[PDB]
Amino acid sequence: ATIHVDGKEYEVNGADNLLEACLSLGLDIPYFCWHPALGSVGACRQCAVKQYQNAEDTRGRLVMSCMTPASDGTFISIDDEEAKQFRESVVEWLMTNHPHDCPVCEEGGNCHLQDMTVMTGHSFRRYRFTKRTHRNQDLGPFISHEMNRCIACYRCVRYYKDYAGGTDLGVYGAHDNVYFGRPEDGTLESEFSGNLVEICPTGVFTDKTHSERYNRKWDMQFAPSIC
């Protein structure tokens, strides 16, 4: 397949969607609800690009890159002004209810939401109203729960239920009171519940064992090892 992103021609796999095709080419499109192992659902509306019908097209149309196939002869723009404004607006909408928590959040410096807030260029707050809050759950000795930081990207439920086959995690409630957790307090029963601390793009699910002796990602000494 052949796509044209911002006037540059690229050869991609036609079976891929536009988001993974552009991310494989080194282009930076912000995204929340898409994961390579989970597929596309089009929830967070962060991955907007402007698709044109032909090469001689000025209007275009905002589309979700994760839900759009990277078919042959596609024409899209990432750095289109309207697409950039919409992606910044989506980040701004996610920031309206987000808690003032980065210094005391274990995801700080390792946070996908922080990276996409910086990437869209959104640093000015004009929202002045109240922020919604949530009570937390006890999820056992391994996973710490903090639902204030949730951006409702549905990656936890998709991984845990559809991928991992777990049954005790779900989404409850409604419009902006969507709650992601267990129906009651207790230990997460899946043998693969620990991957939530990397699946979740925010600091909702965190490593409690790390949170005991916490340090930031930049302060770590890492090595490649085998479990």
Partner 1 sequence: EPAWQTRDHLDDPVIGELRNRFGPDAFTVQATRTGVPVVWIKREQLLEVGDFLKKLPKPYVMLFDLHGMDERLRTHREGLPAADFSVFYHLISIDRNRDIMLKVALAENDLHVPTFTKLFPNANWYERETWDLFGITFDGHPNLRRIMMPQTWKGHPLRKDYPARATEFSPFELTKAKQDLEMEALTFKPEEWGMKRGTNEDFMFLNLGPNHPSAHGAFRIVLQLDGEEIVDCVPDIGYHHRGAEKMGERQSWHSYIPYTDRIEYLGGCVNEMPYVLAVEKLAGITVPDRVNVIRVMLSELFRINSHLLYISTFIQDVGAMTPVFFAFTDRQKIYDLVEAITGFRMHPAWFRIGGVAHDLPRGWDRLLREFLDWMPKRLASYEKAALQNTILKGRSQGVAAYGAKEALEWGTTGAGLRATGIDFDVRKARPYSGYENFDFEIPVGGGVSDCYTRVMLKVEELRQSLRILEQCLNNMPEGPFKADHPLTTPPPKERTLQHIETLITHFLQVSWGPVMPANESFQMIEATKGINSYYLTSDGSTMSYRTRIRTPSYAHLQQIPAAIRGSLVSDLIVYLGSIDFVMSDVDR
Partner 2 sequence: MTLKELLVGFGTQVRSIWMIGLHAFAKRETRMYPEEPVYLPPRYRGRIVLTRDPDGEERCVACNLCAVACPVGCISLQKAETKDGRWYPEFFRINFSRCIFCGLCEEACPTTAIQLTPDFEMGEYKRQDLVYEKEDLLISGPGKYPEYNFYRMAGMAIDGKDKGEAENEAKPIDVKSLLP
Q: Which residues bind partner 2 (CB under 8 A)?
A: 99-105, 108, 128-136, 146, 148-149, 172-174, 177, 179, 211-216, 218-219
In whole angstroms, what is the distance from residue 180 CA to residue 160 CA?
11
Using CB under 6 A as the binding rule, whether residue 154 contacts ligand FES is answered as: no
In whole angstroms, what is the distance from residue 131 CA to residue 95 CA?
9
Give the shortest CB-68-to-ligand SF4 separation in angstroms. Answer: 22
Pull the structure tokens for residue 43: 């929830």
> Which of the choices ligand SF4, ligand FES, partner 2, none does residue 31 contact, using the CB cut-off of 5 to 8 A by kind?
ligand FES
Which helix (H) or strand (E) is 75 found in, with range? strand 74-77
Pull the structure tokens for residue 51: 């698709």
Decide the pairing of beta strands 143-145 and 48-52: unpaired
> Which of the choices ligand SF4, partner 1, ligand FES, none does residue 54 contact, using the CB cut-off of 5 to 8 A by kind?
none
Residues 47, 90, 188, 204: which binds ligand SF4 (CB under 6 A)? 204
> Which of the choices ligand SF4, partner 2, ligand FES, none does residue 45 contact, using the CB cut-off of 5 to 8 A by kind?
ligand FES
In whole angstroms, what is the distance from residue 96 CA to residue 19 CA?
26
Give the shortest CB-96-to-partner 1 separation in angstroms. Answer: 9
In whole angstroms, what is the distance from residue 14 CA to residue 118 CA?
31
Using CB under 6 A as the binding rule, whether residue 44 contacts ligand FES is answered as: yes
Q: Cβ distance 197 to 143 under 8 Å?
A: yes
CB-nearer residue toward ligand FES: 75 or 86: 86
Rg (CA), the chain: 19
Q: Which part of the chain contacts ligand FES (CB under 6 A), choosing from 25-33, 69-77, 94-102, 104-112? A: 25-33
Q: Cβ distance 22 to 29 under 8 Å?
A: yes
Task: Name the residue among 152, 214, 208, 159 with its Cα closest to residue 180.
Answer: 152
CB-nearer residue toward partner 2: 69 or 173: 173
Q: Which residues bind ligand FES (CB under 6 A)?
A: 31-34, 42-47, 64, 66
Q: Which residues bind ligand SF4 (CB under 6 A)?
A: 98, 101-103, 105, 107-108, 111, 113-114, 149-156, 180, 199-204
